[PDB]
Amino acid sequence: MDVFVLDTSVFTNPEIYRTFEERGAMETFIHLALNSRAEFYMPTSVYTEMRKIMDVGELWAEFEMVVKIRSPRRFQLTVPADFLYEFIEELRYRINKGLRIAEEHTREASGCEDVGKLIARLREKYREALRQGILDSKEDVDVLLLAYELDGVLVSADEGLRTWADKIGIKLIDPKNFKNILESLVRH
Amino acid sequence: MDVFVLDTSVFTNPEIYRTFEERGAMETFIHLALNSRAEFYMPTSVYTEMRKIMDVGELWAEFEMVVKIRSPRRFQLTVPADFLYEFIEELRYRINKGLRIAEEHTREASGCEDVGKLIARLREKYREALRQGILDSKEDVDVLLLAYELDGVLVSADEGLRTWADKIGIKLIDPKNFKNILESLVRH
Amino acid sequence: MDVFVLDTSVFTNPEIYRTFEERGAMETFIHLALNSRAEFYMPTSVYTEMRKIMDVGELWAEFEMVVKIRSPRRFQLTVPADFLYEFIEELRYRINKGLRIAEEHTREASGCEDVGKLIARLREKYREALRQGILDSKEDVDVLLLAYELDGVLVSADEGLRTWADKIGIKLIDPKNFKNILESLVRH
Amino acid sequence: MDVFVLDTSVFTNPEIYRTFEERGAMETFIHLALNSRAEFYMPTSVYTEMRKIMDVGELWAEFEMVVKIRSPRRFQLTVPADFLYEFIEELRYRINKGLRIAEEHTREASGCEDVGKLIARLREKYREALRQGILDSKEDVDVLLLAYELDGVLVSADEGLRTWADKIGIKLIDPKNFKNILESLVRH
Amino acid sequence: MDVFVLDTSVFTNPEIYRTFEERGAMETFIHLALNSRAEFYMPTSVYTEMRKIMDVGELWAEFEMVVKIRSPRRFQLTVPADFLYEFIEELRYRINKGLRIAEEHTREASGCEDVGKLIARLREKYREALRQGILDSKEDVDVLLLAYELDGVLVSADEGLRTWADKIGIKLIDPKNFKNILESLVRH
Amino acid sequence: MDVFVLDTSVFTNPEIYRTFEERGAMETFIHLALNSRAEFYMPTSVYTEMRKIMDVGELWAEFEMVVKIRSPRRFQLTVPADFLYEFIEELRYRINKGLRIAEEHTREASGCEDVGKLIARLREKYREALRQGILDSKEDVDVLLLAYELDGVLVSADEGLRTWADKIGIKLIDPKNFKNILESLVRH
Amino acid sequence: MDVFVLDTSVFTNPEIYRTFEERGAMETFIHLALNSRAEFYMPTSVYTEMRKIMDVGELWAEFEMVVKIRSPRRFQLTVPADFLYEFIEELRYRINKGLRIAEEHTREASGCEDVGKLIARLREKYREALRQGILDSKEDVDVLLLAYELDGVLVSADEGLRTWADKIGIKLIDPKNFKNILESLVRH
Amino acid sequence: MDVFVLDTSVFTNPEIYRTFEERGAMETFIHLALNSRAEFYMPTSVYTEMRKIMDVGELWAEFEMVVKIRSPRRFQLTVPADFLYEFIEELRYRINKGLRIAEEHTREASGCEDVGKLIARLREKYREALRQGILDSKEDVDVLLLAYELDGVLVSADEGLRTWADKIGIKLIDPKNFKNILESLVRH
Amino acid sequence: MDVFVLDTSVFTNPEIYRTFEERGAMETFIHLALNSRAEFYMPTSVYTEMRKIMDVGELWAEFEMVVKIRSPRRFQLTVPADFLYEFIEELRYRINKGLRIAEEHTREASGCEDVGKLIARLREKYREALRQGILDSKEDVDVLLLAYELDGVLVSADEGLRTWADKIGIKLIDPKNFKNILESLVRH
Amino acid sequence: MDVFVLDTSVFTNPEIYRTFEERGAMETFIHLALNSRAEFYMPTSVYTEMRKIMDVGELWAEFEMVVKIRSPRRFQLTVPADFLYEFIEELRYRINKGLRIAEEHTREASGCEDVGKLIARLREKYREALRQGILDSKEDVDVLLLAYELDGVLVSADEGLRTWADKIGIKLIDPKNFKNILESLVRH
């Protein structure tokens, strides 16, 4: 049957934390997953970032059971050139926007002595200027490449991952309906 | 014989402007190029950026004659996955460094009222933090892909292009000795 | 179901000796293994090194029953070139570090007459300088190649084996949770 | 015609320095090379190590002309597993021999106060114990991989490179007769 | 379950004759074999050599029942070239050693008139020089090829068969523990 | 055009020494070979045995020019099983014949005191009993495997190589007419 | 369980007629066969030849019950080429021998007037010269092909069928012990 | 272009001897063959039978040049079962006819004392009864198998080879028009 | 147990009508069939032709109970090409024979005025010329295909169905002994 | 490029005789065919029927050159069952229609004494009743099977071949435009 490529953004994001049976989310997900032989996958890099960020006690055993933890075998894969071209072309605009935001916040800091609030606002604006919208870290690229070779169904709540997975030719799924999808595949 | 993939950074950079017979550089380069049938190439994007930045009157005719202006045919090319992996892994560090520099300059701006000099310093430091060292714009990626399919000899003064062209497997040449190289190929 | 590639470092290392039901470890492992048809594997070279190092009386029969003892069929396998490149590039640094440690210990020996303690310290430092971190002997390479063709789940407590198995594309498992993993696969 | 894969050990080693027309060696080699269209090659890593070690003034131009400087394209190449198996199996013995030599020199240092001469002897013996006989650095592996994909004629004075190039299936040439070989190919 | 490839050297060799319930060995082996559906196999050539050498009255019926008697289907099998290379390379040394032994025994015969004892000693030494250690007859090659296609567990007391079966990639078993192995597989 | 796989038995055997223009044979062969682009080949092992046995001064340069010196790449080749079966089946008979000859010569030595002549006769008879007729050393197997992958025309005066090359499917040529064949291919 | 491929030469040959409970043989065979679900088979051609040669009244019903009567499905089967090569190579010798026997009997007939006895002797000798030893008619080939696809246990008293079934890879059984084999499979 | 599989029956049969330019036939055939790169082939067995039967002085050199002499590689080929079925079914009838002819000639020999003429008549009739019409010797089977793997154009004057080559799926050519066919392929 | 593929020609043909307990035949057949779980089958087309030709009152209920009425699933079945080739090759001869019979009967009609008797004779002869001997209608092809996928035992009194079912590889049964066969399978 | 499967109905039918350059048709077709490497094919059976029906002097040589003459290899091909079902279902109707026509012509013959004209009319009507519309002879089936395995472009003027080739999945071409099609493929 279909093979799902998991991600970190499927059981740590608060909304998908809640839709998954409200620690309990992990075990309910595990029991649901073990049924109907829908093979899952998740790259090692994503695994280590997630475990570093979030930890559950002794429940990891069945998670290692069902969700396989590979690396994409990046030596036999090739990504089309236009993908890289578009990535870098968009990244240049993002960098310029971030520089402009940094400039305007420097002037605002020179204006008034409210340094802490302005630093917090800079954290908000710079991250939205650069990290929001495209592939930011290496975990996302690893998810793409792992899901690209196995012809798997990418599952993510990241809005910068979905568009770039759509450009490459990976079939996507609705992240908000993943729980119901898994349940209906398990039952019927 | 060997085929050279040109770039914008071969006859607009002041040092390579000077080593090329000191407008005169373009025509001397053209005459030298027309000899010995060393086919050149240069992507259209680089051509339009260069002509937008620099303009010479009516000399362009023989430049269109000798230096061919293609596009890489980005539909039949594939770049290895580890290249993209390393690119994005390094880019993340660059972004963090740029954010830290922006922070420290905001605090320095809050410290003293020397806004213009600090803005100039921010222009210097941010560009060195991000744009210096890797593929920044799309013209560089276009140069890589054009030089990658024709097995051409990349010619550039960009230090962020050379390393990434070395990773992919393109044969490079010394940019500082290009004029003498072309002359010795022409004569003997 | 999933197929596990065993190793010597799963039931001779003292910590994994203890977590395995505290000779008793072997038989408890055997009974647990015989259930649920999780096929195991272990190369012959590892087998002979382990039996040479450690011996149990007459219990080997069921071990031959369940844990299959192959050789990787090294004639139909190919390892990507970048793997070898990285291996040798790192090995050069290791060799230089070992030479420097040998030098400094020679000078310390010249300094004072405490030869036995310094020889013991040299044994500690040289092994950490070279053998620790990468593929040292041939048993580890055999484990990699056997686990690479069968798409098996490598199981090892060696920290120099895990990284190099991650580079090649083998799916790994947590060595500390292997007993609980096997139990939960057996029961449910 | 045949394509030769060059190396650093063809015009810096004193003996092959002498057999090559006794700076003069480089230019005589260059003139001989430019004739008869025997395409050469040399990896970038070897090029940078050689130029770092040895430098000639302004003669490099024709060297860039004739001797192409690539990288092996290590993403499309595969090395057979038995090669790696034998490499690591031999390396283990080398490491043990080096450790034993370090031990005996520590005891000799404890014996007498002749530290400088013994350090020099340790430099001689340790390098012979480890670096002599097999692929030591990454430049050699790069030479192998570049010569392996182009079906080129490896040319080296390294006795640890020749055996490992013979195991893989690369055709070799006599390094001592390279000059006469090139001359006779040029003339007739 | 696992499939065993039998041999002649499992119930005619005196030691394995004894460990098998001390004619009685054959029938005890047969009863043990009929249980638990561990499919056996044995090539026809081995069968005819064994029956020619050893004969049991009317017990053969159940032996034909349980131990299947095939031929390897040598038309669809391929043996790697390095196997043949190593076989012949070792055989050359064996032949030279046998010739030297023959020479020295000729001189000893010329020395003294003890012809019968020296002929007996020549029988002992020549057989050890050539037939001992490698694949001698065709029955052994037949056992290898039959066990190689079925992925069976080779069972033999021949020390020249085990190494060559290990080179090819056949999983081996302990010949001395075969009886206990079969019993424990039958019972539990 | 056709590609010839050379051997040691083409220009050291006295008869083919004579038919090749009567040191002079090597150079006449070389000049004839350089014409018409009939690519030759010869394995390294054969090369080292031949150079060890026979040496010519400074003529080797053009020999390295024309006759390529590879190794068979024994990792991607497979030899059919029936070939090995027949080889070993015949070898067993050869070994028994050699043992019988050794026996009868021992008795003859016991008979009379003519030890030197009988030792010489034993050298003659034993070599004819074993080494004559089949693949004896590893150089012959190397010639077979090199000629088997390139679909080359094996050229040898060895009567034990020709039959085994005929069994495998290699196209053979007449060794006595090789000189005239090469000449007529060169001229017309 | 095992599936037996029957033949005509299992219950019409007088010796196997006798060992089968001494018409009575057919019914005893049938009752024994119906037990233990050892599926049998027999080709239609063999069936029609046997029924044409031998007939039993009204007992055929249970024979149609137990012994299935197929045709080999000769459209999906392939026989290795070396089999045909050896068959025809041996057949040529047989034909020549038959011609020589015919010649010598013609001369003997010319010698003396004993025509009837010599004709009887010619019937004896010619049949032994050609039909004895190899596959003579089409029923035997049909038995081979039917037994080859089902991986069945060929059962025949024909000495020319057994060798050719051994060459192809069919597992054989002892024809003289078939009754006892079937009985022991039925009982235990 | 098309590849022709030669035979012995193309330049020894008197009629095709004559249509080929009337020793002269061989050399005219050779010159015609060397043109237009129509690759030929001929099995070794056919070659040795032909050279044993017919010999030409020193002309063989160019024959070895153009007409390649392989063996079919009978280990990777498979012949359909219905082919063998039909072959043996027809052979049985041939054998019976030969026996009947032998009988009637025995009676005729008994009748009258004309033994020599009747022996000659028996030679004529028996050969027509058996050898005429089907694959008689092994050279014909070798021609079939060699022509079957290369998809070559079988060329023969044997009327028992043509029908059996038509059954298997080999494309045939007119043997009487081979000379004109080769000429018209050479010229236009 | 075995599964029988019924036909129309098993309980409408007068002879098999009689051997089946002499309407009574249907019910006796039904009771016999319901025992021992010998699954039957019969295609729908045959069912409708039979019910159209022959009708029994209210007995059909148990016939629908026991004899399953499928269609062959003609979308997943494939018939070998040689079957179709032979069918059409024979059909051509049949058509020509029918035309010749029609001609001769036209001339006989022209001869004498006995039109009715000659028309009756034409009905007899034409049907024997074409419809007798091969697959005539579609019901027979349906029986073949249904019996071919289920590996069932075809049961028919049609002499043109039996030969073509024998060519394809379907196991047949004796139609005259079907009643006794079913009885003996039911009882014992 | 595309491969055409020829037929007899492409250069013997008068209309396609005329459109082909009006003996001259054959040679013009041959010259046109030899250009542009559009590989043709034609089965042997069609070839022998055509040559039997029509003969051209000495022009056959180039016809054997260009139009390959195979047999379909009917052992590796399978035709879908529904094809056979439809063929036989339609054939039954054709047979009944032919019988009715034969009847009515018998009555007309009884009516009047015009036997010759009525026999001619019967020849016209019966052939239209049966042979017209479907696959009549074996040559057509051979054309289908040869064109079915090579994925060739069937070329025929037979209206009963086109529909049945359309049912199976063979791509067809316009027979009336074949000459212009071949010309336009040759020129441009």
Numbering used by the authors:
A (entry chain B), B (entry chain A), C (entry chain D), D (entry chain C), E (entry chain F), F (entry chain E), ...: 1 to 22, 25 to 190
Tell me, in the authors' exact words, what the paper reports.
Ribonuclease P (RNase P) is an endoribonuclease that catalyzes the processing of the 5′ leader sequence of precursor tRNA (pre-tRNA). Recently, minimal PRORP (approximately 23 kDa) has been reported in bacteria and archaea. This type was initially found in the hyperthermophilic bacterium Aquifex aeolicus (gene name: aq880). Bioinformatics analysis has shown that homologs of Aq880 are widely present in some phyla of bacteria and archaea (termed HARPs for homologs of Aquifex RNase P).
After 3D classification, the particles converged into a single prominent class with a resolution of 3.62 Å. The cryo-EM structure revealed that Aq880 is a homododecamer. Each subunit has a typical PIN-like fold, which comprises a single α/β/α domain with a five-stranded parallel β-sheet (β1-β5) surrounded by nine α-helices (α1-α9). Notably, each subunit also possesses two prominent helices (α5 and α6) that are inserted into the nuclease domain. Hence, the region of the two helices was denoted as the “protruding helical” (PrH) domain. The two subunits formed a dimer mediated by the PrH domain, consisting of α5 and α6. The dodecameric assembly of Aq880 showed a left-handed one-turn superhelical structure with six dimers. Each dimer was aligned side-by-side with β-sheet interactions to form a hexamer of the dimer. In the present study, the structure of Aq880 revealed that these aspartate residues are localized in the nuclease domain near the PrH domain, representing the active site of Aq880. The structure of Aq880 revealed that the active site of Aq880 contains five acidic residues required for catalysis, which is analogous to the active site of eukaryotic PRORPs.
